């Protein structure tokens, strides 16, 4: 009966089961990501490897219908009061754990074409993330430039890059130049790329959810400390689904090492790590009240709200109730920044009509 | 009050070069930490392994005369306007990378004996951290109890425990119980238990200072998610030298897993992860402005200042210039909580007339 319009910096689409089977040549078509949900488990096959074997809860973790039917998804946007929404891959994310650059490149093209033709075509409120090869810089630059020509506003990078392709390495430089030139936002989504750590013991569910942060913090440390962002002032990076309050914490950690350990520090930066973070690093959250304190108390203005539809850790179907609780008693300019404006700085959707 | 009088939750004592040479059984003597100073490098040997190599400029920058001479240390405390100070090991920290429980147990006993008898005895302004075995719970419990009887107020644990001895494991339960029974604070100091040189490419120095956070965040997640803090309401944990504003960020991350991933969460907790963190998890910093933000906007009141005397990361010798600028225009109550009062909740030193 009373809702506030929001924009969302994070959600996922479920690709068609046969997306890659139907579109790839026979040398490639059997090796592309395949999800099986059977007998209370999700199994993912990539290029002859079991990359996931996760329990499901057939009772208490049932997927929203709109995950399975894109017309129910658009009703859910209106019901939740979300206008614009960034859309990341689901099965497509598994291209980041591929070792074959050819399988990666061709699976990425297929995904970027399907997403635009068949999904983004449903509404210009949908802002797609184009995948680019995590394995090969020439392949990555080619696909970013092709995606830019198709109208994509952001590329997805996995939080854990392949071995020897850390984000501080020179191998990425041409992608940073190409992203800056095209004005593409680089969106680094957590929980993607090779597994780094899996908790097995007591508290595993909570520990595993924390462990997915460390690749995101490391990626920010790598981009800032390496001068990648310093050399590319127009390059903006969105850390998707990692929360926000650690970002000013990391700025202060990097400034302390930069100033106190300066005799070990190479390269030199034109400005402090914390200044590059506050200028170019954005982060999304779903429920975290601390994201608001980062803005009001830590001069970190690059916070974006995200629904993370249709994941358990997102807000659905209580988006409006969550955002009411979050912003009870908060300056409406801060609500406007976090829920609408940062989104429209990074992304272009059609004009949100006014309500009076 | 020409000075702002502070308590320091973090500093280090450099052990006598011959501490272990003289005190250990003959069979163990050669295996204890020892160093060679040649070319312009200090090399540290532990039990048949090179654990650390440093240029002498960096090695000796951490060794102003107060780092060695405890009489000069007390003068430097007065000069810096610091009253109470927690003192952590330097060479003793290498017990956390030993693989032999007997060698670790005996080296720890030698350290704890020297520290109380020859260092802590000069002033009640000094609060020592007793080491306890990282390798064997019975050894760790016996030494915590012995150290308590000697009047120790805190024990040091390494941030990266040995493989299979993660902090969520049942093996630690007897130690949590002994620490709670004795009123002993558990102090986890970052950059211990593991090699700190992880990154070697561009931005390496800044990246490595960030990587030391990941074991600290993992440790808090393990202690919260396992129920170790929930089962021991009297147990307080100090995370030393990791900064502060990531702690409330982690509180929110764990609350989101707890609530949205509840069907996968074991054990259940008597209160939310964020309530355990705000009740029992303390954290120190030297320079970080975001630490004040965590208190004023994220309801995280467990923030302690530390000089980290005499490390480069710390404020020495500009302690008054740093804390004056940090707390310029800050609520005196908040300045008092962070610089004085959390210190005296954890640790007992003679009370200043806060008359001033
Ligand atoms: C520049 C590189 C990347 C080398 O690159 P290249 O191979 O030349 O490409 C590398 O040398 C570097 O990162 N240098 C900065 C100095 C440093 O080692 N940073 C580690 C992270 S900071 C750290 O680990 C603290 C927590 C803070 C500084 C003091 C620290 C190293 C102390 C020092 C040294 C040693 C280790 C120790 C206890 C000890 C007895 O005093 C703690 O375990 C840990 C601690
Ligand atoms: Mn997401
Ligand atoms: Mn998600
Ligand atoms: Mn949910
Ligand atoms: Mn000698
Ligand atoms: Mn320290
Ligand atoms: Mn230090
Ligand atoms: Mn310093």
Automatic annotation (TrEMBL), chains A, B:
Annotated Amidohydrolase-related domain residues: 93-342
Positions annotated to bind Mn(2+) 1: 10, 12, 189, 241, 308
Signal peptide: none
Annotated binding of Mn(2+) 4, by residue: 260, 312, 314
Protein name: PtmU3
Keyword Lyase annotated: yes
GO MF term list: carboxy-lyase activity; hydrolase activity; metal ion binding
Residues noted as binding Mn(2+) 3 in the record, renumbered to the chain: 241, 308, 311, 313
Top-level lineage group: Bacteria
SUPFAM superfamilies the UniProt entry points to: Metallo-dependent hydrolases (SSF51556)
UniProt: Mn(2+) 2 binding residues: 38
Keyword line: Lyase, Metal-binding
Any one Gene Ontology cellular component term annotated for this protein: cytoplasm
A Pfam family it matches: Amidohydro_2
One BP term from GO: secondary metabolic process
InterPro entries: ACMSD (IPR032465), Amidohydro-rel (IPR006680), Metal_Hydrolase (IPR032466)
